Amino acid sequence: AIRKILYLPDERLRKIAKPVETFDESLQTLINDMFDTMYDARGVGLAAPQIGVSLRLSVIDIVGDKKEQIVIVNPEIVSSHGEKEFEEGCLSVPGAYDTVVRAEKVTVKALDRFGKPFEITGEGLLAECLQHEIDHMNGKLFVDMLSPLKRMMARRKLDKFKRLQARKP
Numbered sequence: 001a002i003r004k005i006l007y008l009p010d011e012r013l014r015k016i017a018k019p020v021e022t023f024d025e026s027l028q029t030l031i032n033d034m035f036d037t038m039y040d041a042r043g044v045g046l047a048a049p050q051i052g053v054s055l056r057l058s059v060i061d062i063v064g065d066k067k068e069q070i071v072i073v074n075p076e077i078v079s080s081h082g083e084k085e086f087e088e089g090c091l092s093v094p095g096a097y098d099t100v101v102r103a104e105k106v107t108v109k110a111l112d113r114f115g116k117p118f119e120i121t122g123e124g125l126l127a128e129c130l131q132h133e134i135d136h137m138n139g140k141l142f143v144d145m146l147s148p149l150k151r152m153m154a155r156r157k158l159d160k161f162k163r164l165q166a167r168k169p
């Protein structure tokens, strides 16, 4: 159920994910496994490329209490407003946190986990998460937006995290 999260520089994180074409039982299992993986990592969003599945699919739970689980399949940004700084991290760049600029408000259209079209508008953390998720589906990671010095620092923190995990029994 709980799948391993991939870390930079895994090239599977850099692929352009393919649209979901088939809503079958395997897709529901994938969605359920992604939720389990996201909750285990104590995250609020997870994109399929982050577990090695090259599909334009993400799961979201902003509050964390499973009361409003969001699944976005084949999302497209229909509109956005404003631009502001966010202090941001990423489950696929563990240990590295920095400031990036994204839209302040975004409206996304997608299919839900059963294929029904819906639209969602977000501000704050939800807006940040939606844009971060779509970036993952396009092979983009937040460190790509940083200065060379800050990207180098992020990689150093990531490498320290990896070394620490490898020392565990």
Ligand SMILES: [Cl-]
Residues within 6 Å of the ligand: 043, 045, 046, 089, 090, 091, 092
């Ligand atoms: Cl993430």
Ligand code: NI
Residues within 6 Å of the ligand: 089, 090, 091, 092, 132, 136
């Ligand atoms: Ni991420």
